[model samples]
Target: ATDTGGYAATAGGNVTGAVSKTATSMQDIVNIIDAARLDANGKKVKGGAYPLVITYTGNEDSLINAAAANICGQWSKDPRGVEIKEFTKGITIIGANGSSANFGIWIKKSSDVVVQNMRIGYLPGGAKDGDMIRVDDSPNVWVDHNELFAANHECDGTPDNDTTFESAVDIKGASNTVTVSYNYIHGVKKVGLDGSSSSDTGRNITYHHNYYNDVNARLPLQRGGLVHAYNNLYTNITGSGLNVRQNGQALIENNWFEKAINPVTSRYDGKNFGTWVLKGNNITKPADFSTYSITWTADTKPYVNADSWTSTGTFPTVAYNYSPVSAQCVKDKLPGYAGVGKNLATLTSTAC
Candidate 1:
């Protein structure tokens, strides 16, 4: 079943006036995506499929324009409060162009979706704005083995004429049980892994084994839930590597930070107090420069890495546990890691 005229294809039934071929225009594709909607009673109508693959072979600009239109419409408030979150199952969109638009996949749904093994890059001139993969009010989503190339022209000391728009793979509003791993995300104006937004709290998230390079993006405003970030490599970020706004039960381990303005930045400006554990990570500054090294500093002791870092308000601790490393030899023998400046490229930016 093809979505030729932007029509919704229901299982075991045909859609009259629905185009049966492939989508050729941006409006047609947007209609097809919008048609993946719930009935007036709020029941999903497009069923009977295990996995639906939307393959695109036509003009990349048109496809992405349609997708952006549908996404913007989904965010708007309709009369009946109808939303696009109704269809959240096994949707795979494969684009012919690796660098089609700014964002390759943007979803706001739930359950068992996988976007993998593709290269998603910049958008067309004057297209829609935002993340490459923006997930809002969704769950159990996996984004892996893809290349995210976002170029930031907002750097200081550089000429101001080449300012590219900021983009991220952002998750918001009860987006939980999500795994973002094994991706190469770089050239971003803001953040690589941003799990902050007032809408996203109490979500279980994991970010591991990804590579980030040349990032200068702002951190998310708020954070909540159990976030496990480990085994990632960040190089040449003008700002910070990991920024925790307000989170709970965070475990940060086994990562590498090179030439970052700040390796880790945490803020407790929310109404809740959370727990964070940092272990076995390596951070360094530029090569041949001995004066600038990334260090950890927090408000409290064991220094908590830094002093003078104050909590905005008091928080209730549900449970707390801390123990020293088990073995003296293991702690003493842990070798320090170094930062390398290879695989870094400078991209030219066009007007947004």
Candidate 2:
């Protein structure tokens, strides 16, 4: 009943309670969350129950696109942060597509969450607002089949550039054992970030089969974590891509990159993308940029393990809907497979 390791296997296995703990015949679940972790009188426990399912219910239309920026008067001390969607499988949330002060979702201090088929964008919260979804101080999370964009899904006119800042997804604050897979994330400044610091060292994540299209940096700028990023597509990057810095060790393998300015950099703070290590990546370097493809045998500092899979061979061999394409087929298949839709559960990325 306990996940021995973190990664998507345990993360994948976290969703069993939707069927195991459900008392009803119709196993489809819908949870309604008030921004507060404690409901009514603290009679219910803080955070969520393990084997989570069938505990909270409300009108399905009521809980869409709403999440807590602060929980129980705490600054991200959220245990029930999944109040919005913590492994809340088979559900969909669509933003109205224009602009509102709708804040970003947060996964703070929780575990075993799976979110799929969600569209996060067009929140007019401005530059300092928040990320689309922040995985902070949590574990065992799987984010898939989602579409995350900003600047009104494109930069320039009719877009709220003044407010649209921060990465699409930022796995920060010691969050670990996470997987970001099979989603189309694009049209923004920073794509994604993993583990915000050297102080918070154990944030290990795996990113695969995802599509990074358009705009700016942080094709997962990792600072002090262990990352397995492979079988993904990166196109039209304006800033930098696939960065690891400040003791962050990454296996950036088998991913295809095109038209990217800086496909790989190191942990940066207005200085260099400092102290980075790269391994096993395929790059179609832009005319303007130079590609650096290096193979590393071991880590200088072993936060976890120095060596890992050379490709997606070591990935979870589960039944997934989508498949990752190679550099040749990326332009052809990626547009069809990535992003928020009913097809989120249909494609599989086999380009290991």
- Among the numbered candidates, top lDDT falls to 2
TM-score (C-alpha, index-matched) for candidate 1 = 0.58
Q: Give the residue spans of candidate 2 off by over 4 A.
A: 1-6, 10-31, 34-42, 49-103, 152-163, 267-281, 284-325, 346-352
lDDT per residue (tens digit) for residues 1-352 in model 2? 3222125444332345333332111122323332223335655444533333232221222122332221112112212112243432321232222212223556666665655555655333334435767887767677776777654232333225333355678887756577787778777776776756555555668777688878577767777656766667887777666666665556665566667654665423443233333334454322223443222222244322112322211322323222334544554565666665545543344531
Minimum summed lDDT over a 10-residue window in model 2 is located at 71-80
Please, what is the whole-model Cα lDDT of each candidate in the order they appear? 0.46, 0.51
TM-score each candidate. Answer: 0.58, 0.63
Q: Candidate 1 on 8-40: residue-level lDDT in tens?
A: 121211223222323343344454555544455
